[PDB]
Amino acid sequence: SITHLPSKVVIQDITMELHCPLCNDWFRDPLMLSCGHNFCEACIQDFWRLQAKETFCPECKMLCQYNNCTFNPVLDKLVEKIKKLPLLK
Amino acid sequence: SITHLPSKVVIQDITMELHCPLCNDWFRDPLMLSCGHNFCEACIQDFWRLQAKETFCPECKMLCQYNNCTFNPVLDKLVEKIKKLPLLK
Ligand SMILES: [Zn+2]
Ligand SMILES: [Zn+2]
Ligand SMILES: [Zn+2]
Ligand SMILES: [Zn+2]
């Protein structure tokens, strides 16, 4: 995209990217799946253990293998920082 | 950390987290290594091909295996968004 965006809209977009789509809260110990999507470790583990018959990604439906999941620590750092951001608009 | 931070300081901290430590520019097609650190794909590939005798992480020095690297697409999305943020302070 090549359009200017309202400051508040950009902050909100950034914030949506740091929210887990399973719990709709801030990522906590996010795992990244083979497709590149991220979920709280607890959220994706419970989804797979409890709701899903194969280990697929809830967002894109691609078949991930459990053993290919990896921690995504940069997301923890970004969550910590942005929660401290004063929203001046 | 449990201290309030200046808005501008928080934006700058967030921005440092979205910069590749090898090139000091915005992440472009970042790969995440087994240790959880991220670098532009081109940057870490050139580092390993050209400067380094084993595939270690330039930040933490841990021995990563090349085949365990993964794309970290969330970082591309965050780079795109934050570059559009008007800096009002
Ligand atoms: Zn979650
Ligand atoms: Zn996915
Ligand atoms: Zn780079
Ligand atoms: Zn590292």
JSON list of C-alpha atoms in Angstrom, two decimals, chain A residues 1 10 14 18 24 29 35 46 55-56 58-59 61 63 66 81 85-86 88:
[
{"chain": "A", "resi": 1, "resn": "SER", "atom": "CA", "xyz": [0.00, 0.00, 0.00]},
{"chain": "A", "resi": 10, "resn": "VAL", "atom": "CA", "xyz": [-1.56, 2.70, 12.19]},
{"chain": "A", "resi": 14, "resn": "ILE", "atom": "CA", "xyz": [0.15, -2.70, 14.69]},
{"chain": "A", "resi": 18, "resn": "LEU", "atom": "CA", "xyz": [0.40, -8.34, 18.11]},
{"chain": "A", "resi": 24, "resn": "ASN", "atom": "CA", "xyz": [-7.90, -12.18, 20.92]},
{"chain": "A", "resi": 29, "resn": "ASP", "atom": "CA", "xyz": [4.96, -17.06, 24.45]},
{"chain": "A", "resi": 35, "resn": "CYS", "atom": "CA", "xyz": [3.02, -21.32, 7.51]},
{"chain": "A", "resi": 46, "resn": "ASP", "atom": "CA", "xyz": [-5.05, -26.42, 23.35]},
{"chain": "A", "resi": 55, "resn": "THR", "atom": "CA", "xyz": [-2.38, -30.10, 13.36]},
{"chain": "A", "resi": 56, "resn": "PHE", "atom": "CA", "xyz": [-3.54, -27.41, 10.93]},
{"chain": "A", "resi": 58, "resn": "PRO", "atom": "CA", "xyz": [-6.55, -22.07, 12.39]},
{"chain": "A", "resi": 59, "resn": "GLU", "atom": "CA", "xyz": [-5.95, -19.03, 10.09]},
{"chain": "A", "resi": 61, "resn": "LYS", "atom": "CA", "xyz": [-5.80, -24.13, 7.27]},
{"chain": "A", "resi": 63, "resn": "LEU", "atom": "CA", "xyz": [-1.15, -28.68, 7.57]},
{"chain": "A", "resi": 66, "resn": "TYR", "atom": "CA", "xyz": [3.93, -29.82, 15.49]},
{"chain": "A", "resi": 81, "resn": "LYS", "atom": "CA", "xyz": [6.98, -2.25, 24.43]},
{"chain": "A", "resi": 85, "resn": "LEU", "atom": "CA", "xyz": [2.98, 3.35, 24.52]},
{"chain": "A", "resi": 86, "resn": "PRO", "atom": "CA", "xyz": [0.95, 6.40, 25.68]},
{"chain": "A", "resi": 88, "resn": "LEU", "atom": "CA", "xyz": [-1.92, 10.54, 22.68]}
]
